[PDB]
């Protein structure tokens, strides 16, 4: 666990690469961790992108992954929607995460306005309900938000936004910092009972708890309880 406690899970590709970091990353004392992450960065970032419950937030416009510090403002607000709003179901994984994506948007506004008076284009978070249609409107109102990358300052802000109290833990990993363990393994199992939200929607990267022995004792899906019982 993140608490360190032992757990039995379906050894999916994710839960495998999770055991991985248990042995190589979370095995080391806090200090020496961050250093070791930077050395296996692009590796951990691949295995992150490829087969884990939470993906690397580092995508760019073209499709490839990059550093959060290398994304444009646009690209970030976009990737936020991408990874928290389920397209084919027209829903956010959680209102809180819509707020989040909303607040950062608000920020990009601020970063790119330089005179008092102008109000926000996103005036109510209700606007993000059908997001991708509306978002592009705001982002286009602040042109350069598609030309230049996040301020170092803003990256730091973003990162604290993904941490706030009373928000569902972000469904990805923003970078490999001192908190990478939190980023990775907080609130993990909800994605088992909603693979529709999961990236690619394959259980392959998902966290499902199971005893070692009571795994043969299940052979048919979808048996009504009163039957089994």
């Amino acid at each position: 666990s993140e608490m360190g406690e032992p757990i039995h899970k379906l050894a999916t590709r994710g839960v495998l690469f999770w055991k991985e970091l248990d042995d190589k990353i979370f095995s080391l004392d806090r200090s020496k961790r961050v250093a070791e992450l930077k050395k296996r960065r692009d590796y951990i970032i691949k295995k992150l992108n490829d087969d884990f419950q939470k993906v690397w937030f580092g995508r760019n416009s073209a499709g490839e992954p990059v550093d959060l510090e290398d994304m444009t403002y646009a690209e970030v607000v976009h990737r936020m929607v991408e990874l928290m709003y389920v397209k084919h179901e027209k829903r956010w994984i959680d209102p809180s995460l819509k707020k989040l994506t909303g607040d950062f948007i608000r920020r990009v506004e601020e970063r790119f306005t330089s005179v008092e008076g102008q109000p926000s284009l996103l005036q109510n978070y209700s606007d993000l309900d059908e997001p991708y249609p509306a978002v592009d409107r705001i982002l286009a109102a602040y042109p350069e938000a598609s030309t230049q990358l996040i301020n170092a300052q803003d990256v730091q802000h973003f990162l604290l936004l993904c941490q706030r109290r009373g928000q569902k833990p972000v469904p990805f990993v923003p970078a490999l910092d001192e908190n990478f363990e939190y980023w990775f393994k907080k609130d993990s199992l909800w994605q088992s009972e909603d693979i529709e939200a999961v990236y690619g929607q394959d259980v392959g990267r998902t966290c499902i708890l199971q005893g070692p022995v009571a795994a043969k004792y299940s052979k048919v899906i979808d048996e009504p309880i009163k039957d089994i019982l």
Binding site: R106, E109, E110, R111, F112, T113, S114, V115, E116, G117, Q118, P119, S120, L122, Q123, N124, E144, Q148, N151
Partner: peptide, 15 residues
């Protein structure tokens, strides 16, 4: 509270 013109506060970016 939730229904007041949110007027963004100008920041500065060093391009």
């Amino acid at each position: 509270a939730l229904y007041r013109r949110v007027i963004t506060e100008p920041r500065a970016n060093l391009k």
